[PDB]
A paper describes a structure:
Symmetry expansion of the pseudo-C2-symmetric dimer particles was used to classify individual F1/c-ring monomers into rotational states 1, 2 and 3 and resolve structures at 3.0- to 3.9 Å resolution. The E. gracilis F1/cring maps of rotational states 1 and 2 showed strong density for IF1, but weak density in rotational state 3. Subsequent focused classification of the IF1 binding site suggested complete inhibitor binding for rotational states 1 and 2, whereas rotational state 3 displayed a mixed occupancy, with a minority (34%) of particles containing IF1 and a majority (66%) not containing the inhibitor. Unlike the bovine ATP synthase, which displays a nearly equal particle distribution among the three rotational states, rotational state-3 (20%) is less populated than rotational states 1 (44%) and 2 (36%). Rather than reflecting dwell times during rotary catalysis, the distribution of rotational states is likely dictated by accessibility of the respective catalytic interfaces to IF1 binding, which for rotational state-3 may be sterically hindered by the proximity to the peripheral stalk. In all three rotational states, IF1 is bound to the βDP-αDP interface adopting a similar conformation. We observe this contact in all three rotational states, which provides the first observation of an interaction between the peripheral and central stalk in the ATP synthase. The position of the lumenal H5EG1 on the c-ring β-barrel remains largely unchanged in all three rotational states, suggesting a mechanism of transient rotor-stator interaction during c-ring rotation.
The mitochondrial ATP synthase is a membrane protein complex that generates most of the ATP in eukaryotic cells. The translocation of protons through the membrane-bound Fo part, mediated by subunit a, drives the rotation of a membrane-embedded c-ring and the attached central stalk, which together form the rotor. The torque of the rotor against the stator subunits induces conformational changes in the (αβ)3 headpiece, thereby triggering catalysis. To reveal how the mitochondrial ATP synthase is modulated by lipids and organised into a dimer shaping discoid cristae in Euglenozoan mitochondria, we determined the structure of the ATP synthase dimer from E. gracilis.
Residue numbers in the entry:
A (entry chain H): 17 to 176
B (entry chain D), G (entry chain E), I (entry chain F): 379 to 501
C (entry chain G): 3 to 255
D (entry chain N): 20 to 68
E (entry chain I): 2 to 67
F (entry chain A): 283 to 562
H (entry chain B): 283 to 422
Write the structure that this text describes.
C-alpha cells in the first residue's frame, strides 16, 4: 500500500481573513465593508462611511474604528452610507456581523435583496396570511406566521 | 481449476476492455475494477524473461517450475496478493521474484521522495 | 466475409451514434458550467470569519483518534458519472484514513454503491439534491441536521476545490465539536495572542467578543458558520463536477 | 473486508449474471420491471378499494 | 416563541428567506433566488441491496426533527 | 458425422483436380446437394417400414463464430436444429458451451417426453425471463427476483462433463423451477445435486416417511417416463423428498460450509465443487 | 393512420435504445418515456401465439380480427391503455385477452406478496 | 428510368453469356460507358438547336444504404447532382424521405426562378443551422 | 521559417478556438489573445481577390510576388503591424494595399462621425 498518496489542502486556507490588531494607535477613516448572502458577495471590501444594522437588542450604528463586536442580525433592513452621502438599503434574513477595530465589516447573511426589488402590493397580501396563520391555534402554523410577520413588519414600516 | 479460473477472469477482462478503452476505469463497479486490476496482474505475470531474449529484455532468464506456477496463480486468484502493484508482475518469474521487485520499487520510490525533500530544502 | 464487414459496419454506426450522444452530454454540461462559472468571480469572501472561528493548527490524525470516540467524514460525491477521478479519489482518501472510530454520511448517489462495498458498517446513508434547484442554506441545514444525529467529535467535510478548469483538487473542512470549540475558545481567549502555525490568523479579540455574546447566539454562530462551510463545499463540488466532466468527456470523444 | 467480489469460488459471492444475455438492453429492462411492479401494486390496491 | 418549539436557528433563517423570496418583485433576481429556497433534496440509505428513505429529518420547514 | 467441412474439402479437391469449375469459396457448386443427399436419409420411418429411425448429429467447424460461411449456411438450411457452441462461454467457464439464443430445435415438445415436456415448458419461460435480467450486475442482493435465482441455479445445473440419467436430471431441474434450491448459494448448486442423486440424506438422517420415492433405485425412471412427476402419486412424494433434502442440506452442510475461513479448507471445498460439476 | 403512427413510433424507439444504452432512462423527457413505454408495449403486443406453434409455445392460438386489430392498437396509440402492464401484451391476441392476463398476473403477484407475509409470520 | 441497376444486370447477363471478359462485381468494364452513352444524351440544347432540352431522373436502388457500390459510384460520377432518400425517415413520417446533407444539385440556383432563389437561400441558411442544432440537442 | 511559424500560429489558434467555444475569450492569457488576433488577421490575409472575376464581382485582382509576401507575413508575425484592424486584411494583396484599405476605413468612419455630429448639432 502506498504511504499516504493523498495530502488534501485545508479549504479555510483559501480564504483571506483580516488579522486583528492590538495597540495599533491609528483610527481608520472609512470602513471596508463585505456583505455576503448564501455564498456570493454583493460587495467586496468597499470603502464605506457608515452602516446601520438591526439586532434583537435594538438598532445599532457602526462607523470607522468601531469596537470589535460580533453579534446577530435581526431579520430586517440594513443601511449602507457611502462617502458620497448616498445610501443603499438591503433586506436580509439573519446573519452575523463581524466588526473590526482596524475597520472591516463582514455581514454574512442567508439573503440580501435591495428594497427596490420589493413591491408593497405583493407584501400586503402576505401580511393578512401570516396574521391569520398566527391566529390559528396550531404550533405548526402559529410559529410560521409569527416569523413571516416578524420579517414583514419592518418592511411595512420602512416602505412607508 | 486454477487454469480454468484464470481463463474465466481473462474472458471477463476482455469484455470489460470494450468499456475501459472508451469511458475509463472509473465508470466501473468496485467489483469490476478489482477484477480488472487482478486480470492485469495475471496478464503481466504471464510474461517472463528468457535466456534467449537477454539482448532485448535486458534481464536474466528464469525457469519457472510447474509446481510453483500453480500456487502463484492461485494466490493471485484468491486475492492472497492484492497489495502488490501491477508492474511488479511484469517480466518476472515466480511470486518470490514479484515480491523482490515490489521491494525494489518501493525502496526506489521512497528514495526519490527523500531526494526531492533534500532538493527542496537545499532549494 | 459478409458477416465480418456487416459487423464492422454496425460497430461503425454504433460508435457514431455514441459520439453524437456524448457530444450532446458535452453541450448540456457546458451550459451548466457557463452558468456556474459566474460564481467563480464572486467566491472566496464569505468564509473568512468562519475560518477565523473554526480553524485550528494541523492536528495529526493518530492523536485525534485516541482523543476522540466517534469521528465523522462527509464525502461530497456526485449524482451522475463521467466526472473523472473525483469520487474514486474521495474513496481512496477515506480508505487511506480508515480507522475504527469513523462514520460516513455522504452526499450523492455514487457514494451509495461504492462506499457500502468498501466501508460495510461505518457508512450510514447519504443525501441527494436533484440539481433542478440550486443548493441553498437550508440544504446545508439539512446536512447539519443529518450530521447531528451522531455525537461526533470532529467532522471532516471532504470536497473538490475548483482551482481552474484543468485543476479540481481535494479539500477538507475539519469542523470541531461545539463543546470542544467553546472550551478551546475560552482557553485561547485567556492567554495572549500567538499564532502556532504559519498562514493562521490571530483572533483573540474575536474569541473575547464571542465571550461577550450569549450562549444561544454562540450556538447559532457555530451552526451558521458550519452551514456556510458545508454550502461552499457543495458549490465547489458542483462546479468541479461540471468542469471535470468536460475533460472526462473530451477524452471519451 | 475490502470487497466481496463474485466468482466461481465459494468464499466469493454469487455471480447471477449470464454472459449470453446482453448488457445493452439492461437499463430498459430495469425501468420496465420497476414500472410493471408499480402498476401491479397499484392494481392490488385498486382491486381492494 | 419558535425557540422552545424545537426548530433550529437555521430553519428560521430559511423561512425568513422564503418569505423574502415571496414578497419580492418579478424579475431575473427572483428567478435566481427561488432556486435558493425550493425543496428538492432527499435522504437515502442502502439496505442489503435496495434503497430506502431516511425520513426522520424532513426537508419541509414547518416540521420538527425527532 | 465428424467435420463435414473436411468432407467438403475432399469433394473440392476431387472436383477441381478433375477440372470441374469452381464456385463460391472454390467449391464446385453442388456441395449443397451433397449434404442434402446425406442428411435427408435421416428419418423416422413409418410403421409400414418397421418404425425404424436414425438420428444424425453432424458436426461443423466454425471460424471466428461466423455462421456466414458457405457450408455452414448450406447445412443449417438442411438440418432441423443446431447446437451452437460458443468459445466465449467455453472460455467463459461453462461447459458444455451451448448458446440457447442461437441453438434451437424444430421438433420441440414432440421429441422429448411427458415428464420433460412440463419441465421444459417451465424452463423456456424462466430462461426467456432470465435473459432480459441477467445482464444486470446483481444489486438488489436480497431484492433479487425469483427468476434471477432459478435461472442461475439452472445454468449451474447445465454444467456437466459426462451424460446424465433422465431421473438424475428431471428431479434436479424440478427443484430449481419450483424454487426448492433457492436458499443455498450458487456455488453449492451442484454439490446439492450430488447429494440429491448419490448420497440420500433422508435415508441417512432417518427422515424416511416416503413410501417409495428415493433416488437410489435408478428404476423409478420408467415410472416418471410413463406417468410423469405431475401426477397424483409422484408429486407429493417428490416434494416430501426434496424439501427434507433442502432442509438437511441447509442445516448441516450449508452451515458448515459458510464457517470456513482457512485457505486450505476453502481450497479443498473449491476443488470438491468443481469435481461435482464434472462428475454430475 | 394507426399503422403509420406505429411505424413512426418505432423509429424513435430505435433512436432511444441508442440513448438509453448510454445515458439511462433518467435522461429523457416524460413525453419521451411515454412513447418508449408505448412502443415497448406495441412490440410485445404484436407477438401472437399460433395454433401450429402449440408444440413450442404450449399455448392455444388466437385469431385476431382486423377491426379489433385496429381498435386495440389505436387505444394503445393514444394512451387509452397505459395503466395496463407491459408483459400482459406478450403473446396474446386482442385487448380483452390482455386485460385477462393483467388480472391474472396481479392475482399471482398478490399471492406472492401474501405468501411472503405468511412466511415472515411463520419465521 | 425505373431502373438502371436492372439494366446493368441485364448487360452483365448478356456479356457473361457471350463470354465478354468480366470485371468488378461480374460487370464488364464498359458498363460505365453504357450509362455515359445514355445520360450524356440528356442536355440543354443551344438556341441554334431549337433550345430543346432532355432531362433525366435515373433511379438506382441501394442495398443497406450502400453508396460505395459500382453502379452507384458510376452514376454519381456521371450525374449533375443526386437525390438520396432514406428509410429511417420514410418510416418516421418524413415522406419524401430525403437526406439533405447527401442530396446535392450542382445546378444550385441557375435552375431556380426569380421568386425561388430568395426562398431557397433562406431555407438553406435555415436548414444548415437546424441540422447543427437538432444534432446536438437531447431527446427531451 | 515564416511558413512554419504561420503553421504553428494557426495550429495554436485552432486549439484556442476549441477553447473559446468552451470557456470564452477572456479565459485565455494575454499572450494567447494576441496570437488569436494575429491568426485571425493571417486567415483574413490569405483571402486574395482574382483578376479573373474582376468583371463579375468588380473588385480588382492582385498578383503578389514571393519575397513581398514573406516580408508581409514576417511583419505580421513580428507584431510590427498589429494596430491595423482585422477586416482590412480581408480580400487584399500585400501589406502595401491593406494599408490603403485601412486608410479608407478610417476616413470613412471619420466621415460618418463628422456627418452624425453635425446632423445632431444642427438640430
Amino acid at each position: 500500500q502506498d504511504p499516504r498518496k493523498f495530502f488534501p489542502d485545508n479549504g479555510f486556507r483559501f480564504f483571506d481573513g483580516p488579522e486583528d490588531s492590538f495597540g495599533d494607535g491609528n483610527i481608520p477613516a472609512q470602513i471596508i465593508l463585505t456583505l455576503t448572502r448564501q455564498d456570493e458577495f454583493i460587495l467586496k471590501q468597499e470603502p464605506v462611511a457608515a452602516i446601520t444594522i438591526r439586532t434583537n437588542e435594538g438598532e445599532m450604528g457602526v462607523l470607522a474604528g468601531h469596537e470589535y463586536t460580533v453579534q446577530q442580525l435581526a431579520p430586517g433592513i440594513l443601511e449602507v452610507e457611502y462617502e458620497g452621502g448616498k445610501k443603499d438599503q438591503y433586506v436580509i434574513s439573519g446573519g452575523f456581523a463581524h466588526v473590526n477595530d482596524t475597520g472591516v465589516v463582514d455581514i454574512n447573511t442567508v439573503e440580501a435583496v435591495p428594497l427596490e426589488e420589493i413591491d408593497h402590493e405583493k407584501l400586503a397580501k402576505a401580511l393578512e396570511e401570516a396574521r391569520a396563520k398566527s391566529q390559528s391555534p396550531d404550533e405548526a402554523v402559529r410559529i410560521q406566521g409569527e416569523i413571516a410577520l416578524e420579517i414583514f413588519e419592518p418592511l411595512e414600516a420602512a416602505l412607508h | 481449476n486454477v487454469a480454468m479460473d484464470i481463463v474465466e477472469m481473462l474472458t471477463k477482462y476482455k469484455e470489460l476492455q470494450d468499456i475501459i478503452a472508451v469511458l475509463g476505469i472509473d465508470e466501473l463497479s468496485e467489483e469490476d475494477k478489482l477484477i480488472v486490476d487482478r486480470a492485469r496482474k495475471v496478464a503481466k505475470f504471464m510474461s517472463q524473461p528468457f535466456a534467449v531474449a537477454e539482448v532485448f529484455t535486458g534481464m536474466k532468464g528464469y525457469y519457472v517450475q510447474l509446481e510453483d506456477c500453480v500456487s502463484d496463480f492461485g494466490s493471485l486468484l484468491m486475492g492472497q496478493c492484492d497489495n502488490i502493484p501491477e508492474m511488479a508482475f511484469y517480466m518476472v518469474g515466480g511470486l518470490d521474484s514479484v515480491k523482490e521487485k515490489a521491494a525494489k520499487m518501493a525502496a526506489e520510490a521512497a528514495a526519490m521522495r527523500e531526494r526531492a525533500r533534500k532538493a527542496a530544502e537545499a532549494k | 466475409g459478409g458477416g465480418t464487414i456487416r459487423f464492422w459496419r454496425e460497430k461503425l454506426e454504433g460508435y457514431k451514434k455514441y459520439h453524437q450522444i456524448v457530444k450532446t452530454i458535452k453541450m448540456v454540461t457546458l451550459a451548466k458550467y457557463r452558468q456556474t462559472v459566474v460564481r467563480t468571480r464572486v467566491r472566496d469572501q464569505t468564509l473568512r470569519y468562519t475560518r477565523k472561528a473554526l480553524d485550528a493548527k494541523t492536528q495529526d490524525d493518530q492523536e485525534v483518534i485516541e482523543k476522540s470516540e466517534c469521528l465523522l467524514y462527509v464525502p461530497i460525491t456526485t449524482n451522475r458519472g463521467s466526472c473523472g477521478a473525483l469520487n474514486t479519489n474521495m474513496v481512496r482518501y477515506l480508505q487511506e484514513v480508515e480507522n475504527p472510530k469513523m462514520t460516513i454520511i455522504s452526499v450523492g448517489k455514487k457514494a451509495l454503491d461504492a462506499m457500502t462495498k468498501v466501508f460495510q458498517d461505518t457508512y450510514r446513508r447519504t443525501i441527494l439534491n436533484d440539481m433542478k434547484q440550486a443548493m441553498s442554506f437550508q440544504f446545508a441545514a439539512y446536512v447539519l441536521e443529518h450530521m447531528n444525529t451522531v455525537p461526533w467529535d470532529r467532522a471532516q467535510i471532504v470536497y473538490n476545490r475548483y482551482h481552474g478548469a484543468a485543476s479540481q483538487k481535494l479539500a477538507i473542512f475539519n469542523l470541531p465539536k461545539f463543546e470542544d470549540w467553546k472550551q478551546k475558545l475560552e482557553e485561547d481567549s485567556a492567554g495572549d495572542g500567538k499564532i502556532e502555525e504559519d498562514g493562521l490568523l490571530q483572533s483573540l479579540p474575536m474569541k473575547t467578543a464571542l465571550g461577550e455574546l450569549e450562549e444561544t447566539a454562540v450556538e447559532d454562530f457555530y451552526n451558521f458558520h458550519s452551514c456556510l462551510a458545508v454550502l461552499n463545499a457543495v458549490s465547489e463540488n458542483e462546479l468541479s463536477e461540471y468542469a471535470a466532466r468536460i475533460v472526462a468527456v473530451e477524452n471519451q470523444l | 473486508n475490502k470487497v466481496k467480489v463474485p466468482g466461481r469460488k465459494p468464499q466469493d459471492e454469487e455471480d447471477l449474471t449470464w454472459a449470453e444475455a446482453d448488457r445493452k438492453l439492461t437499463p430498459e429492462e430495469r425501468y420496465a420491471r420497476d414500472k410493471q411492479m408499480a402498476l401491479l401494486d397499484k392494481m392490488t390496491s385498486q382491486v381492494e378499494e | 416563541s419558535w425557540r422552545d418549539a424545537g426548530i433550529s436557528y437555521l430553519r428560521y433563517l430559511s423561512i425568513v428567506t422564503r418569505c423574502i423570496h415571496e414578497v419580492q418583485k418579478e424579475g431575473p433576481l427572483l428567478t435566481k433566488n427561488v432556486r435558493f429556497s425550493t425543496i428538492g433534496w432527499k435522504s437515502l440509505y442502502l439496505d442489503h441491496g435496495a434503497t430506502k428513505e431516511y425520513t426522520a429529518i424532513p426537508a419541509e420547514l414547518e416540521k420538527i426533527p425527532e | 458425422y465428424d467435420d463435414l467441412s473436411k468432407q467438403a474439402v475432399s469433394y473440392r479437391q476431387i472436383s477441381l483436380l478433375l477440372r470441374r469449375p469452381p464456385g463460391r469459396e472454390a467449391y464446385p457448386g453442388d456441395v449443397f446437394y451433397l449434404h442434402s443427399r446425406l442428411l435427408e436419409r435421416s428419418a423416422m420411418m413409418s410403421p409400414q417400414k418397421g418404425s425404424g429411425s436414425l438420428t444424425s448429429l453432424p458436426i461443423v467447424e466454425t471460424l471466428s463464430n461466423d455462421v456466414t460461411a458457405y457450408i455452414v449456411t448450406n447445412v443449417i438450411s438442411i438440418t432441423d436444429g443446431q447446437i451452437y457452441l460458443d468459445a466465449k462461454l467455453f472460455t467463459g467457464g461453462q461447459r458444455p458451451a451451448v448458446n440457447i439464443g442461437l441453438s434451437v430445435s424444430r421438433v420441440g415438445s414432440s421429441a422429448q417426453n411427458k415428464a420433460m415436456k412440463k419441465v421444459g415448458g417451465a424452463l423456456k419461460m424462466l430462461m426467456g425471463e432470465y435473459r432480459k435480467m441477467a445482464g444486470e450486475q446483481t444489486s438488489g442482493s436480497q431484492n433479487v427476483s425469483p427468476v434471477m435465482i432459478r435461472g442461475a441455479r439452472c445454468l449451474q445445473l447445465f454444467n456437466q462433463k459426462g451424460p446424465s440419467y433422465f431421473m438424475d436430471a428431471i428431479v434436479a431441474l424440478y427443484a430449481v423451477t419450483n424454487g426448492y434450491m433457492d436458499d443455498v448459494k450458487l456455488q453449492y448448486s451442484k454439490f446439492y445435486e450430488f447429494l440429491l442423486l448419490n448420497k440420500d440424506l433422508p435415508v441417512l438422517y432417518g427422515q424416511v416417511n416416503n413410501k417409495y420415492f428415493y433416488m437410489y433405485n435408478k428404476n423409478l425412471n420408467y415410472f416418471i417416463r410413463y406417468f410423469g412427476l405431475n401426477h397424483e402419486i409422484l408429486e407429493p412424494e417428490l416434494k416430501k423428498y426434496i424439501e427434507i433434502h433442502t432442509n438437511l442440506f441447509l442445516d448441516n452442510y450449508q452451515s458448515r460450509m459458510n464457517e470456513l475461513k482457512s485457505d486450505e479448507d476453502l481450497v479443498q471445498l473449491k476443488n470438491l465443487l468443481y469435481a461435482c460439476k464434472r462428475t454430475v
